[PDB]
Amino acid sequence: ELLLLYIEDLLNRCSSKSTSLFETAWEAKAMAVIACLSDTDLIFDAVLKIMYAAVVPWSAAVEQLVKQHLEMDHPKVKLLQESYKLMEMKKLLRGYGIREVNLLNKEIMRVVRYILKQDVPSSLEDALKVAQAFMLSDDEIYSLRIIDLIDREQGEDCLLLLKSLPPAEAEKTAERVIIWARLALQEEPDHSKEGKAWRMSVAKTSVDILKILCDIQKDNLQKK
Amino acid sequence: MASFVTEVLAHSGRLEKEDLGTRISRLTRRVEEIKGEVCNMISKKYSEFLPSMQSAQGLITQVDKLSEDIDLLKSRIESEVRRDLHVSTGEFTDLKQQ
């Protein structure tokens, strides 16, 4: 217990004031203390506390420690993999300029919108895991992707994404995008060329996705 | 009990029309500050809104106190317009428009 508390104090005296990420003196001193432990329960959680204090991404020695602790078996190794994917989402967030740890619930949709505004080929995948790890439905992810592509008049990409999706989430995305399209068409018409072009594109992209949804819902008589 | 209020008004009669115009300009530039702030946090709340949750309550407070300032300065202008209706009307109304 005192060795673990010494490791915690060593983490606190370095990482809390860490302006420059070169104070690696705690890693070398903490590995020896890890080797001094005799209880397996107090080794994995000590390494986790190293994980929960070190700045993502960690250094080379810490990377060796993580790969070592992934190899053996323990009930807390599942928690270690949870912390590993936590490191992954922290890496994603800090690569997209969001450095706060564990945004609570309300900024997840804003983060997804920001990632989808980067036009990265993996931005859809990046925003997928944001709602996955934070326990939010994939319906919103693909719905917003289809809406963004419609606003860009790229309905062919919407069609290929819909055909790539499983039908279960495809129904949910299609009904929501149809509701959004009718609501957006309910406001005042735009007399500019771009406005009317957008209405025409929205209608043309809605007709064939409605056809696909009709093909999907052949047996659901209430929805049919 | 003999005419002491008249000299107290002199301590408040130092607020000239130039001082009224400076306050109008100050309120206009603060309105512009808040307008630019709202334009900034619109894109924040739509794209990138980490460091502005407390700034929303700060906006509520500053807009409330700015509305109070607008109301009190309008009351001050209206109090003096009715007094001088022949010599100070034009310059009071010119700044009341802003």
From Swiss-Prot, chain A:
High expression in testis. Signal peptide: none annotated. It comes from the Eukaryota. It is found in: Cytoplasm; Nucleus; Chromosome, Centromere, Kinetochore; Cytoplasm, Cytoskeleton, Spindle. Essential component of the mitotic checkpoint, which prevents cells from prematurely exiting mitosis. Required for the assembly of the dynein-dynactin and MAD1-MAD2 complexes onto kinetochores. Its function related to the spindle assembly machinery is proposed to depend on its association in the mitotic RZZ complex. Interacts with ZW10; the interaction is required for stable association with the kinetochore. Component of the RZZ complex composed of KNTC1/ROD, ZW10 and ZWILCH; in the complex interacts directly with ZWILCH. This is Kinetochore-associated protein 1. It comes from Homo sapiens (Human). The lineage of its organism: Eukaryota, Metazoa, Chordata, Craniata, Vertebrata. The gene is KNTC1. The chain holds residues 754 to 977 of 2209 of the full protein.
UniProtKB/Swiss-Prot annotation, chain B:
Residues 14-98 form a coiled coil. It is found in: Cytoplasm; Endoplasmic reticulum membrane; Chromosome, Centromere, Kinetochore; Cytoplasm, Cytoskeleton, Spindle. Widely expressed. The modification N-acetylalanine is found at A2. The modification Phosphoserine is found at S3, S12. Residues 2-81 are annotated as: Interaction with ZWINT. Essential component of the mitotic checkpoint, which prevents cells from prematurely exiting mitosis. Required for the assembly of the dynein-dynactin and MAD1-MAD2 complexes onto kinetochores. Its function related to the spindle assembly machinery is proposed to depend on its association in the mitotic RZZ complex. Involved in regulation of membrane traffic between the Golgi and the endoplasmic reticulum (ER); the function is proposed to depend on its association in the interphase NRZ complex which is believed to play a role in SNARE assembly at the ER. Overexpression as well as silencing of ZW10 disrupts the morphology of the ER-Golgi intermediate compartment as well as the Golgi apparatus and slows down ER-Golgi transport. Belongs to the ZW10 family. Interacts with NBAS and KNTC1/ROD; the interactions are mutually exclusive and indicative for its association in two different vesicle tethering complexes. Component of the RZZ complex composed of KNTC1/ROD, ZW10 and ZWILCH. Component of the NRZ complex composed of NBAS, ZW10 and RINT1/TIP20L; NRZ associates with SNAREs STX18, USE1L, BNIP1/SEC20L and SEC22B (the assembly has been described as syntaxin 18 complex). Interacts directly with RINT1/TIP20L bound to BNIP1/SEC20L. Interacts with C19orf25 and ZWINT. Interacts with ZFYVE1. This is Centromere/kinetochore protein zw10 homolog. It comes from Homo sapiens (Human). The gene is ZW10.
